[PDB]
Design a protein around this ligand. Structure first.
Ligand SMILES: Cn1nc(-c2cnc(N)c(-c3cn[nH]c3)n2)nc1C1(c2ccccc2)CC1
Length: 820
C-alpha cells in the first residue's frame, strides 16, 4: 500500500519520487522527512475531529462578504420532500426542526444532530447565521429559484470522515575566487558579481577582467564588506555577459546553508539563461546540467563558522514624513527607533528599510526591537512578505501576524502567498509550514494550494520546491490525493480531446468535428474519466454525468472545449459547464478575475452590490486551464449581429441589446434586467479603468439573460497593450432605458461609478501590496515599478478624496465626450 501511494503521488505531481532521492541533497532529505512528520500529525488530528469540526474542514461555510422564501427539504434515504415557507432572517436549526416536525407527522413518530446539504453539491448550511447570509441562499434569492436541501445526520458525516482515513571574529573583507566557465556565445566575457540583501546591495558590484570567448579566470574578487557584517540572508549573485551589452546567463547562491553554516569551498553554478544582476532570481541551480552554462567558484576557508543564535543576537518632522526618503530623514527614523516601537508599531516596514543591513550591530539592534514588536494588522504583514524585506526573522514575524487571517481572507490572498514561495531561499521555511498547516485544516484551501503548485510543475526553477510541498500535502491527505488524481485523469483526457479537435477543425466542417468529438467522448475510457469528479474550478461543485450531446468547442484560435454536465441529485443546480483551453497562458486572466472578485467583496462590505460575475479561471498545467461556464450568456457581438426571425430583431442596431433583454425579461422583469445591467456596467467600467484593461470590444464583453454584463479574455492590463475611462453608447442606451435623453438614469449610473471608485481608493494599499507580491510570478505585464505606478495613478492614492474625485469626474466626462 506504501508503494502504491508512492506511485500515485508521482503520477499526481508529474515527477517521480525516485528523482528527489537521485539528487542525494541533505536539504531535500531533511525537508521531506520533517514535512511528512508535520503532515501526518495534521492527518492524525483530522481523523479524530468532531462531526461539526469535520464539516468545517471538508465543507467550510460559503457566506456573503424580514422576507419570506420557499425551501425544499428532503432526507438522505428518501425521494419525498417538503416545501416549507421560511424567512430570510431564520437560522438553519429552525428550518431543521420544521423538517423533523413534518417527518414526525408523515412517519407518525433533535435538530442539533443534523446539517443541511445543498442538493448535489459539497456545500452545507450550518452555524448561527441567518439563511440570507449563506452564498447559496443569496444566489437563490437573486435568481428567484427555490433552495433545495437535504437533512444529513451526524452519523452519515462521521461515516465520511472514517471512509476518508489515511562569526563576529572574522573582520577580513568578503572575497571569492572565480575559477572558470563552460558556455556558448559569439567579443569578450565578464562576470559581474554582487552581494545583495533583497533588492538592496550590501556593497558596490565587482566586475571580472575581460577574457576572450571553457573560459578560465582564476582571479580573486573582493567585496567592500567585512565577513562578520554579512547578514544571515546574504545572497551572492552572478551575471555572465559579453562585451564588444550582451547578457548570456545569471546564477545566485546563499552565503549560508540551510543549517546556518557559512559555505566553503568549491562550488559549481548551473546558470540560467537571460531574456544585469538578478537578486530576486532563484538560489538553486539549473537542473539541465547537459546544456547549461556553468561557472566554478571557490569560497575560501575562514577556519566551521555558523551564524549566531537569536540569544547571542539579542544580547548585542518625524510624523510629517512618516506617511523614498532623504539621507537625514533615514537617520531621524533610525535614532528614534524606540519611539517607532512604542508609538508607531505599524511603521515597522519604513524602519526595516532604513536599517543598515551590511552592519551586524544595526541588525542586532533592529532584531532586538522586532522580538518585542507588537503583532501587526494583516495589511501590514502582507507588506513584510515582499522581497524588500528578506530577513528570516522579519519573515517569521510577518507569518506570526498573518496567523489571525480567517480561511476566507487566506483564500482571497492564496495566489499571492504561493508566489512568495518563489522568493524563499531555503526549502524548509515558515511560509511553507503555514500554507501546509492551513491547507491540511481546510479541504478547499488544500485544493487550490495543490492546483497553484501543480500548474507550475513545467517551470524548472520551481519544479523541486512545488513537487516537495505537494508530496508533503499528499502524506497529510491520502483521500484528497485520490480525489485530485480523478481531476488530473479528466484533464489528461480533455488535452487529448482538444488535440484531436485542433487537428480536425483545419480538415473538415464544425458539424463533422463535433460529431467525431462526441464519438471519442462516448468511448468507455472517456465516459469514465470525464464523469463523477469534483470540479478543479470549485471542489463544492460536482461534475457528474458528462452531457456529450451538449458538448462542443469554441471557434477561437485554440479551439477551446465546451463541456456540459448534469446531475439527477442536484437537478438544475447540477447543470454546469466547464471550458478547457490549451495553448494560452491563463495566469494573467486568473489574476485579473481575482482582483475584480476582490473589488466585488470590498464593495459588498460597504453595502454596494454591483452584480458582478466572478467566474472561475484556473491554470492546471503548461498553457492549460479551465474556465467556469456562465450559463444563459452571450457576447455583445452575437447580440449585435441583429439576426432576422428573432424576438431581439431591431429597427436600429442601438436597440438590439435592449430588445434581447426585453425578450429574455418579459413584462415586469425588464425593470430588474435594466437595473442588473446598469450596476454590473458601473462595476466593470471602474474595474477596467483601475486595472488598465484595454482592447475591449463587443466580442470580449458578455451579457447574462438577467441583464448582468461581464468581461472575458483578459490578455492585457496595467496599460500594457495609459488606458482612458471608456463609455459605450449601446450600453448608455440600455441604461437610459432606450430613451434618447434620460439624465436621471445616466447620473444614477455616474453615482454608482463614483461610489465604486472611492471604496477601492480606501483599500488602495491592499491592491498595491497584493500586486507587489504578484511580481514574483514572472508575468510580462507585471515586471517593474512602472506597472505598480499605474495603480497609484488610476486610484490617485497620493491625493485627498476631494482632489481624486474631481480627477475621476474629469476622466468620466472625457469618456462621455468620446461616446459619439
Ligand atoms: C454561449 N456562450 N457562453 C459563453 C461563455 C460562458 N461562460 C464563460 N465563462 C465564457 C467565457 C469565454 N471566455 N472566457 C470565458 N463564455 N460563450 C458562449 C459562445 C459559444 C460557446 C460555445 C460554442 C460556441 C459559442 C460564444 C457564444
Amino acid at each position: 500500500v506504501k508503494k502504491l501511494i508512492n506511485s500515485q503521488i508521482s503520477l499526481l505531481i508529474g515527477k517521480g519520487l525516485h528523482e528527489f532521492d537521485s539528487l542525494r541533497d541533505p536539504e531535500v532529505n531533511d525537508f521531506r522527512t520533517k514535512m511528512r512528520q508535520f503532515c501526518e500529525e495534521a492527518a492524525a488530528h483530522r481523523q479524530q475531529l468532531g462531526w461539526v469540526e469535520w464539516l468545517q474542514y471538508s465543507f467550510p461555510l460559503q457566506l456573503e462578504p424580514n422576507r419570506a422564501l420557499l425551501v425544499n427539504v428532503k432526507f438522505e434515504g428518501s425521494e419525498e420532500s417538503f416545501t416549507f415557507q421560511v424567512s430570510t432572517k431564520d437560522m438553519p436549526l429552525a428550518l431543521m426542526a420544521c423538517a423533523l416536525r413534518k417527518k414526525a407527522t408523515v412517519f407518525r413518530q433533535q435538530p442539533e444532530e443534523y446539517a443541511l446539504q445543498v442538493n448535489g453539491r459539497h456545500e452545507y448550511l450550518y452555524g448561527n447565521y441567518p439563511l440570507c447570509h449563506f452564498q447559496y441562499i443569496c444566489s437563490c434569492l437573486h435568481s428567484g429559484l427555490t433552495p433545495h436541501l437535504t437533512m444529513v445526520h451526524s452519523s452519515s458525516i462521521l461515516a465520511m470522515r472514517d471512509e476518508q482515513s489515511n562569526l563576529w571574529s572574522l573582520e577580513q573583507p568578503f572575497s571569492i575566487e572565480l575559477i572558470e566557465g563552460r558556455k556558448v556565445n559569439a567579443m569578450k566575457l565578464v562576470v559581474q558579481a554582487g552581494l545583495f540583501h533583497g533588492n538592496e546591495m550590501l556593497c558596490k558590484t565587482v566586475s571580472s577582467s575581460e577574457v576572450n570567448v571553457e573560459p578560465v579566470w582564476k582571479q580573486r574578487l573582493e567585496f567592500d564588506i567585512s565577513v562578520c557584517d554579512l547578514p544571515r540572508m546574504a545572497r551572492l549573485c552572478f551575471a555572465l555577459y559579453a562585451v564588444v551589452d550582451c547578457p548570456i546567463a545569471w546564477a545566485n547562491l546563499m552565503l549560508f546553508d540551510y543549517k546556518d553554516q557559512l559555505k566553503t569551498g568549491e562550488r559549481c553554478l548551473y546558470m540560467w539563461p537571460s531574456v544585469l544582476l538578478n537578486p530576486a532570481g532563484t538560489v538553486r541551480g539549473n537542473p539541465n546540467t547537459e546544456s547549461a552554462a556553468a561557472l566554478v567558484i571557490y569560497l575560501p576557508e575562514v577556519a566551521p563558522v555558523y551564524f549566531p543564535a537569536l540569544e547571542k543576537i539579542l544580547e548585542l518632522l518625524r510624523e510629517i514624513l512618516e506617511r523614498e526618503l532623504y539621507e537625514h530623514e533615514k537617520d531621524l527614523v533610525w535614532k528614534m527607533r524606540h519611539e517607532v516601537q512604542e508609538h508607531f508599531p505599524e511603521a515597522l516596514a519604513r524602519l526595516l528599510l532604513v536599517t543598515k543591513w551590511n552592519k551586524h550591530e544595526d541588525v542586532a539592534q533592529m532584531l532586538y526591537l522586532l522580538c518585542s514588536w507588537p503583532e501587526l494588522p494583516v495589511l501590514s504583514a502582507l507588506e513584510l512578505l515582499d522581497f524588500s524585506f528578506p530577513d528570516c526573522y522579519v519573515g517569521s514575524f510577518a507569518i506570526k501576524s498573518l496567523r489571525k487571517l480567517t480561511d476566507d481572507e487566506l483564500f482571497q490572498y492564496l495566489l499571492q502567498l504561493v508566489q512568495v514561495l518563489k522568493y524563499e531561499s531555503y526549502l524548509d521555511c515558515e511560509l511553507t509550514k503555514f500554507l501546509l498547516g492551513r491547507a491540511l485544516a481546510n479541504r478547499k484551501i488544500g485544493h487550490f494550494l495543490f492546483w497553484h503548485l501543480r500548474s507550475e510543475m513545467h517551470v524548472p526553477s520551481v519544479a523541486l520546491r512545488f513537487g516537495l510541498i505537494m508530496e508533503a500535502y499528499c502524506r497529510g491527505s491520502t483521500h484528497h490525493m485520490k480525489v485530485l488524481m480523478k481531476q488530473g485523469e479528466a484533464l489528461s483526457k480533455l488535452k487529448a480531446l482538444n488535440d484531436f479537435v485542433k487537428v480536425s477543425s483545419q480538415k473538415t466542417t464544425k458539424p463533422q468535428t463535433k460529431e467525431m468529438m462526441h464519438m471519442c467522448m462516448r468511448q468507455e475510457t472517456y465516459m469514465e474519466a470525464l464523469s463523477h469528479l469534483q470540479s478543479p474550478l470549485d471542489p463544492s461543485t460536482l461534475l457528474e454525468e458528462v452531457c456529450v450531446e451538449q458538448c462542443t468547442f469554441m471557434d477561437s484560435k485554440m479551439k477551446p472545449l465546451w463541456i456540459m454536465y448534469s446531475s439527477e441529485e442536484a437537478g438544475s443546480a447540477g447543470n454546469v459547464g466547464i471550458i478547457f483551453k490549451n495553448g494560452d497562458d491563463l495566469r494573467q486572466d486568473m489574476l485579473t478575475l481575482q482582483m475584480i472578485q476582490l473589488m466585488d467583496v470590498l464593495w459588498k462590505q460597504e453595502g454596494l452590490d454591483l452584480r458582478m460575475t466572478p467566474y472561475g479561471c484556473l491554470p492546471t498545467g503548461d498553457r492549460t486551464g479551465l474556465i467556469e461556464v456562465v450559463l444563459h450568456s452571450d457576447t455583445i457581438a452575437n447580440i449585435q449581429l441583429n439576426k432576422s426571425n428573432m424576438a431581439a430583431t431591431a429597427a436600429f442596431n442601438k436597440d438590439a441589446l435592449l430588445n434581447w433583454l426585453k425578450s429574455k425579461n418579459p413584462g415586469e422583469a425588464l425593470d430588474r434586467a435594466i437595473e442588473e445591467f446598469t450596476l454590473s456596467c458601473a462595476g466593470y467600467c471602474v474595474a477596467t479603468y483601475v486595472l488598465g484593461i484595454g482592447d475591449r470590444h463587443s466580442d470580449n464583453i458578455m451579457i447574462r439573460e438577467s441583464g448582468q454584463l461581464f468581461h472575458i479574455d483578459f490578455g492585457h492590463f496595467l496599460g500594457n497593450f495609459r488606458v482612458p475611462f471608456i463609455l459605450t453608447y449601446d450600453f448608455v442606451h440600455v441604461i437610459q432605458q432606450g430613451k434618447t435623453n434620460n439624465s436621471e438614469k445616466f447620473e444614477r449610473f455616474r453615482g454608482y461609478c463614483e461610489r465604486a471608485y472611492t471604496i477601492l481608493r480606501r483599500h488602495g494599499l491592499l491592491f498595491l501590496h497584493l500586486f507587489a507580491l504578484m511580481r514574483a510570478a514572472g508575468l510580462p505585464e507585471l515586471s517593474c515599478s512602472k506597472d505598480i505606478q499605474y495603480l497609484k495613478d488610476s486610484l490617485a492614492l497620493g491625493k485627498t478624496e476631494e482632489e481624486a474625485l474631481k480627477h475621476f469626474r474629469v476622466k468620466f466626462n472625457e469618456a462621455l465626450r468620446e461616446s459619439w
